Amino acid sequence: IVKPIVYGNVARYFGKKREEDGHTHQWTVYVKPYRNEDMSAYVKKIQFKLHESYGNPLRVVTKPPYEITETGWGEFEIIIKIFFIDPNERPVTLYHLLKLFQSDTNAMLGKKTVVSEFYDEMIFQDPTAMMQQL
Numbered sequence: 649i650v651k652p653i654v655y656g657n658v659a660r661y662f663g664k665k666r667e668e669d670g671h672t673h674q675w676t677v678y679v680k681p682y683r684n685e686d687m688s689a690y691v692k693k694i695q696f697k698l699h700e701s702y703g704n705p706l707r708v709v710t711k712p713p714y715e716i717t718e719t720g721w722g723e724f725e726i727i728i729k730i731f732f733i734d735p736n737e738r739p740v741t742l743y744h745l746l747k748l749f750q751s752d753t754n755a756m757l758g759k760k761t762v763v764s765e766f767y768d769e770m771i772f773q774d775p776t777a778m779m780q781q782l
């Protein structure tokens with residue numbers, strides 16, 4: 649009944665802002681299981697709703713890795729929605745802040761990489777008969 653997951657984003661500073669992009673970072677938002685497993689056994693698709701400044705702001709992934717790589721210059725909230733192969737099982741929605749800018753302690757070491765990830769657990773209190781292929 650309990651499937652653990654890690655979700656969030658990693659990001660890296662270009663080092664110098666790009667001149668006709670304005671972009672300063674490469675980043676990846678993602679959902680992965682806590683340990684290796686094929687989520688696609690039970691995940692139909694994962695939706696990432698990105699900031700509307702992006703094109704095709706709704707990004708749907710149907711096969712792992714459930715991740716999206718992109719470039720940008722601002723921080724914003726990403727809505728991650730996980731739909732299951734049985735539609736009668738309720739989808740799981742997570743909210744994540746795409747983090748790009750590091751703290752001052754970390755700027756002064758000169759770190760180019762930030763990561764903002766969180767462990768979570770998808771709970772199936774009384775799963776579908778079919779959902780017992782989990």
Ligand SMILES: [Mg+2]
Nearest residue numbers: 758759760761
């Ligand atoms: Mg670094």
